[PDB]
Design an enzyme around this catalytic site. Structure first.
Site, PDB file in Angstrom:
ATOM      1  N   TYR A  66       0.863  -1.163   0.000  1.00  0.00           N
ATOM      2  CA  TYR A  66       0.000   0.000   0.000  1.00  0.00           C
ATOM      3  C   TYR A  66       0.908   1.224   0.000  1.00  0.00           C
ATOM      4  O   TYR A  66       1.862   1.278   0.779  1.00  0.00           O
ATOM      5  CB  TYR A  66      -0.909  -0.055   1.236  1.00  0.00           C
ATOM      6  CG  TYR A  66      -1.702   1.179   1.440  1.00  0.00           C
ATOM      7  CD1 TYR A  66      -2.970   1.302   0.923  1.00  0.00           C
ATOM      8  CD2 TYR A  66      -1.168   2.255   2.163  1.00  0.00           C
ATOM      9  CE1 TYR A  66      -3.701   2.443   1.121  1.00  0.00           C
ATOM     10  CE2 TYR A  66      -1.888   3.409   2.349  1.00  0.00           C
ATOM     11  CZ  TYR A  66      -3.160   3.493   1.833  1.00  0.00           C
ATOM     12  OH  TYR A  66      -3.904   4.627   1.999  1.00  0.00           O
TER      13      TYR A  66
ATOM     14  N   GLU B  60      -3.507   7.303  -4.266  1.00  0.00           N
ATOM     15  CA  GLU B  60      -3.538   6.119  -3.424  1.00  0.00           C
ATOM     16  C   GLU B  60      -3.402   4.900  -4.322  1.00  0.00           C
ATOM     17  O   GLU B  60      -4.200   4.722  -5.243  1.00  0.00           O
ATOM     18  CB  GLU B  60      -4.838   6.065  -2.627  1.00  0.00           C
ATOM     19  CG  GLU B  60      -4.934   4.861  -1.718  1.00  0.00           C
ATOM     20  CD  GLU B  60      -6.209   4.888  -0.879  1.00  0.00           C
ATOM     21  OE1 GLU B  60      -6.144   5.141   0.353  1.00  0.00           O
ATOM     22  OE2 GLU B  60      -7.274   4.678  -1.472  1.00  0.00           O
TER      23      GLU B  60
END
Lengths: 234, 229
Positions: free
Chosen positions: B120, B204
């Site tokens: 992530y 993101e």
């Protein structure tokens, strides 16, 4: 009369065969655009640029201005552009063209794949037997006359009942005779049936796949795939 | 306001990032055509069909009529048709949508690749300077929110952008070794240009992946992307 590689492959696909037909490009910039778009799908892949010329010995040939190869590996879309720029609009010299060469004005851009095995497979009318025959060897990428002369053990010649066959049992034995095991046996059966349908339904005098490959997919499955194709007519 | 996964990936690619943006389709017929054409280039490949909806929790979500998942593996162009047909024009219910769900009017079709690692990584603007957050853990965006201590957090000098030393350290801190470190550095520099030059509040990437190319090279690649403005 022969049709080009990418057209032959498209015809094979139409009849249910697996072939790497890629995408044809009529300019170096289009060749690059094909490569770039493919990086949306298989990011980081490599590319193969194949000159589309009506002549044999394409891959082993050399260009008038010095580049080696009618089939070349490219790591990026820009390398694809640079290679296509030396093919499109230029003359390729092969063993079959002689010094006169042959003009190239288009290329195929393909994704580079892991090739595990190369076979030769052709379908043509045999004069002696008076029927279609499948000729195949496990030694693809070679002169078929050299295999018969120097390595007759790996050559197989299968007569076909003109529209009463080929039978499933002939194709399974051929596939197993070529050294195929597992799911590739049936995959080979299915692909050879499609090649016969091309030969039959398109009234071809020869369907030649050199090489018929075992390749890996991007997730490592092994599959049968036509990697070059030549279909002749009268 | 967020843009969709495939648009986010296309924007990243424009700035030199590696991203599997695939190709978007607004009908199941187009989805199938995309897949069929891809078999000209990578014969025998498999496909992934991803509902393009502005809502989280797609992978765990389910559609009204029973199909499981907003992200689905398809072995053939016809399976691509069938899956897309259950997505396009239908409502996907995820934990973030609630029972009201969200209509899907498009999917992305992309080639199936081997994913070796999922990270992530996000670039966010809150009241101070840009920050890069990342974790080496694989539903990971909520882990980031309810366990922020599991995150690397890297403040960015807005005047000097991220230094190379910060990104090499970040890549190595995420467990990358060898050529993947620099590959990761290069890709995060592109994500920063998108963040900066497009005045984004968040880029993101969940996941940023290590994938294999069709000839088995390992490369860094954005596998999902959400960009806010």
């Amino acid at each position: 009369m022969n049709i080009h590689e990418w057209q032959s492959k498209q015809l094979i696909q139409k009849y249910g065969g697996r072939a790497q037909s890629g995408e044809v490009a009529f300019s170096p910039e289009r060749s690059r655009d094909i490569a770039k778009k493919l990086w949306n799908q298989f990011p980081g892949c490599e590319f193969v640029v194949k000159a589309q010329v009506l002549a044999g010995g394409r891959g082993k040939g050399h260009w008038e201005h010095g580049m080696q190869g009618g089939v070349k590996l490219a790591k990026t879309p820009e390398e694809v552009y640079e290679i296509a720029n030396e093919m499109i609009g230029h003359k390729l010299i092969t063993k079959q063209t002689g010094a006169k060469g042959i003009n190239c004005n288009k290329v195929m851009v393909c994704g580079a794949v892991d090739i595990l095995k190369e076979f030769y497979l052709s379908i043509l009318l045999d004069r002696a037997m008076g029927c279609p025959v499948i000729i195949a060897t496990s030694q693809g990428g070679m002169g078929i006359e050299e295999v018969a002369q120097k390595c007759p053990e790996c050559l197989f010649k299968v007569p076909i009942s003109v529209k009463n066959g080929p039978t499933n049992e002939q194709l399974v034995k051929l596939a197993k005779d070529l050294g195929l095991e597992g799911d590739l046996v049936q995959d080979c059966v299915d692909n050879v049936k499609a090649l016969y349908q091309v030969f039959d339904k398109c009234d071809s005098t020869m369907v030649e796949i050199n090489p018929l490959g075992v390749i890996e997919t991007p997730t490592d499955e092994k599959v049968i795939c036509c990697l070059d194709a030549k279909i002749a007519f009268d």
